[PDB]
Design an enzyme around this catalytic site. Structure first.
Site, mmCIF file in Angstrom:
data_model
loop_
_atom_site.group_PDB
_atom_site.id
_atom_site.type_symbol
_atom_site.label_atom_id
_atom_site.label_comp_id
_atom_site.label_asym_id
_atom_site.label_seq_id
_atom_site.Cartn_x
_atom_site.Cartn_y
_atom_site.Cartn_z
ATOM 1 N N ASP A 138 0.804 -1.218 0.000
ATOM 2 C CA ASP A 138 0.000 0.000 0.000
ATOM 3 C C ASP A 138 0.846 1.282 0.000
ATOM 4 O O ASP A 138 0.549 2.230 0.761
ATOM 5 C CB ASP A 138 -1.041 0.003 1.133
ATOM 6 C CG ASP A 138 -2.083 1.103 0.966
ATOM 7 O OD1 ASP A 138 -2.347 1.551 -0.205
ATOM 8 O OD2 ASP A 138 -2.607 1.565 1.999
ATOM 9 N N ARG A 142 0.005 9.253 0.753
ATOM 10 C CA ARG A 142 -0.669 9.376 2.043
ATOM 11 C C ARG A 142 0.019 8.500 3.118
ATOM 12 O O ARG A 142 -0.085 8.772 4.301
ATOM 13 C CB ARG A 142 -2.172 9.008 1.914
ATOM 14 C CG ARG A 142 -2.452 7.488 1.787
ATOM 15 C CD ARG A 142 -3.936 7.109 1.482
ATOM 16 N NE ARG A 142 -3.958 5.732 0.969
ATOM 17 C CZ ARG A 142 -4.003 5.388 -0.310
ATOM 18 N NH1 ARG A 142 -4.098 6.316 -1.268
ATOM 19 N NH2 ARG A 142 -3.961 4.105 -0.614
ATOM 20 N N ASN A 143 0.734 7.454 2.675
ATOM 21 C CA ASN A 143 1.535 6.554 3.544
ATOM 22 C C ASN A 143 3.016 6.852 3.567
ATOM 23 O O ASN A 143 3.846 5.963 3.822
ATOM 24 C CB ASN A 143 1.350 5.086 3.125
ATOM 25 C CG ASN A 143 -0.060 4.588 3.440
ATOM 26 O OD1 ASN A 143 -0.708 5.129 4.337
ATOM 27 N ND2 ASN A 143 -0.571 3.650 2.647
ATOM 28 N N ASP A 156 2.858 2.708 7.580
ATOM 29 C CA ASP A 156 1.821 1.740 7.260
ATOM 30 C C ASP A 156 2.324 0.406 6.755
ATOM 31 O O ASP A 156 1.539 -0.367 6.219
ATOM 32 C CB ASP A 156 0.865 2.322 6.236
ATOM 33 C CG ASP A 156 -0.535 2.348 6.744
ATOM 34 O OD1 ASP A 156 -0.673 2.447 7.992
ATOM 35 O OD2 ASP A 156 -1.470 2.218 5.908
HETATM 36 C C1 LIG Z 1 -5.455 19.746 9.421
HETATM 37 N N1 LIG Z 1 -4.312 18.845 9.543
HETATM 38 C C2 LIG Z 1 -3.623 19.220 10.769
HETATM 39 C C3 LIG Z 1 -2.446 18.315 11.067
HETATM 40 N N2 LIG Z 1 -2.619 16.923 10.648
HETATM 41 C C4 LIG Z 1 -1.669 16.009 11.031
HETATM 42 C C5 LIG Z 1 -1.901 14.659 10.925
HETATM 43 C C6 LIG Z 1 -0.932 13.757 11.297
HETATM 44 C C7 LIG Z 1 0.291 14.193 11.769
HETATM 45 N N3 LIG Z 1 1.256 13.368 12.132
HETATM 46 C C8 LIG Z 1 1.264 12.055 12.068
HETATM 47 N N4 LIG Z 1 2.242 11.445 12.723
HETATM 48 C C9 LIG Z 1 2.365 10.151 12.736
HETATM 49 C C10 LIG Z 1 1.468 9.369 12.043
HETATM 50 N N5 LIG Z 1 1.345 8.068 11.872
HETATM 51 C C11 LIG Z 1 0.305 7.877 11.113
HETATM 52 N N6 LIG Z 1 -0.165 6.708 10.691
HETATM 53 C C12 LIG Z 1 -0.070 5.553 11.339
HETATM 54 C C13 LIG Z 1 -0.076 4.366 10.640
HETATM 55 C C14 LIG Z 1 0.000 3.153 11.302
HETATM 56 C C15 LIG Z 1 0.088 3.101 12.676
HETATM 57 C C16 LIG Z 1 0.088 4.281 13.382
HETATM 58 C C17 LIG Z 1 0.012 5.494 12.712
HETATM 59 N N7 LIG Z 1 -0.223 9.035 10.805
HETATM 60 C C18 LIG Z 1 -1.402 9.183 9.944
HETATM 61 C C19 LIG Z 1 -0.964 9.770 8.605
HETATM 62 C C20 LIG Z 1 -1.610 11.131 8.528
HETATM 63 C C21 LIG Z 1 -2.861 10.981 9.351
HETATM 64 C C22 LIG Z 1 -2.414 10.158 10.524
HETATM 65 C C23 LIG Z 1 0.464 10.005 11.352
HETATM 66 N N8 LIG Z 1 0.382 11.337 11.365
HETATM 67 C C24 LIG Z 1 0.513 15.553 11.875
HETATM 68 C C25 LIG Z 1 -0.454 16.458 11.505
HETATM 69 C C26 LIG Z 1 -3.659 16.528 9.687
HETATM 70 C C27 LIG Z 1 -4.813 17.499 9.748
#
Ligand SMILES: CN1CCN(c2ccc(Nc3ncc4nc(Nc5ccccc5)n(C5CCCC5)c4n3)cc2)CC1
Length: 304
Positions: A138, A142-143, A156
């Site tokens: 995947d 986005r990942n 991911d």
């Molecule tokens: C309006 N925007 C304001 C800021 N925003 C945002 C979102 C996420 C982060 N950071 C961050 N960090 C680690 C992540 N690890 C996974 N993913 C993840 C995958 C597998 C297991 C644990 C986490 N993510 C996902 C990817 C983006 C959405 C959340 C993660 N995202 C910082 C700012 C989005 C909305």
């Protein structure tokens, strides 16, 4: 090594805010509170949607040890797990978020050096997975997460096996036969490169997922992004050849994009590009000390 995977209790952490979601689950900013200490340490937590049976519990756990063993500057390591009614996966929180949002929010204020380096770093992370004989399944903008603007990390890894099909990212053999290989990962890498180069366009926008196999079979492909020179586009097209073994290898992709990164303006055409350059060593050093202490290979620089 089982010691790479911390088993957490629901009492040691809390979900605080929703960060995003995907087919798999919902991602939260969380707080880890250790061990009779006051402090609250930010983390990222993905909670999987379907409740967990105990028997599958061993299966999830076995996969989690593999996810936790991933050790590379360009791939996110699974840090911890909590098993209950739900499976919760604990990872590093990244202030900058995902690459897909980053390139959108910086559309057209991003330099050829950044885009070409990201391509290199993504290929290095995927190469490492291939070297461990692991398949992502995947890969997509986005990942990929942004640790600093200079340092991106694929995330991911491993859930796609572990448990909304991203058809527009998928090699044709994956769409038709659900075959996943390093070479299908290369196909999705090509799509990911295309998302970066268009500053986060949606691939095949407006076209139903059900039609994608037919248009691929007719030899149609994502269109050349306007910043891309022909050599860049040909690499993308190679990633999407029907014959999986005709596609480049990630080790070749590292070499080709690194060479382009040495002469960035020859390969991408971006207005204002001279106004945009990689951070001075001063700015790089400050970023590393504040939020990126982890060991990593040097970013590729322009020869001139
Ligand atoms: C309006 N925007 C304001 C800021 N925003 C945002 C979102 C996420 C982060 N950071 C961050 N960090 C680690 C992540 N690890 C996974 N993913 C993840 C995958 C597998 C297991 C644990 C986490 N993510 C996902 C990817 C983006 C959405 C959340 C993660 N995202 C910082 C700012 C989005 C909305």
């Amino acid at each position: 090594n089982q010691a790479l995977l911390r088993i957490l209790k629901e009492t040691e952490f809390k979900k605080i805010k929703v960060l995003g979601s995907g087919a798999f689950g919902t991602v939260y900013k969380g707080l880890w509170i250790p061990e009779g200490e006051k402090v609250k340490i930010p983390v990222a937590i993905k909670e999987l949607r379907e409740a967990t049976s105990p028997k599958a519990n061993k299966e999830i756990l076995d996969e989690a040890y593999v996810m936790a063993s991933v050790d590379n500057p360009h791939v996110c390591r699974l840090l911890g797990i909590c098993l209950t009614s739900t499976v919760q996966l604990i990872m590093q929180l990244m202030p900058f978020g995902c690459l897909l949002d980053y390139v959108r929010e910086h559309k057209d204020n991003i330099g050829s050096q950044y885009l070409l380096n990201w391509c290199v770093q993504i290929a290095k992370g995927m190469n490492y997975l291939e070297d461990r004989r692991l398949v992502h399944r995947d890969l997509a903008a986005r990942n990929v997460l942004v640790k600093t603007p200079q340092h991106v990390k694929i995330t991911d890894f491993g859930l796609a096996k572990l448990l909304k099909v991203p058809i527009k990212w998928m090699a044709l053999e994956s769409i038709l036969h659900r075959i996943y290989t390093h070479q299908s990962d290369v196909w999705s890498y090509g799509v990911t490169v295309w998302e970066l180069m268009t500053f986060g366009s949606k691939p095949y926008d407006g076209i139903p997922a059900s039609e994608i196999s037919s248009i691929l079979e007719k030899g149609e492909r994502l269109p050349q992004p306007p910043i891309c020179t022909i050599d860049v586009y040909m690499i993308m097209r190679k990633c999407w050849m029907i014959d999986a073994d005709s596609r480049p290898k990630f080790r070749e992709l590292i070499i080709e994009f690194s060479k382009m990164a040495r002469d960035p303006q020859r390969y991408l055409v971006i207005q204002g590009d001279e106004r945009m350059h990689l951070p001075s060593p001063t700015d790089s050093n400050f970023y590393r000390a504040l939020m990126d202490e982890e060991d990593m290979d040097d970013v590729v620089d322009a020869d001139e």
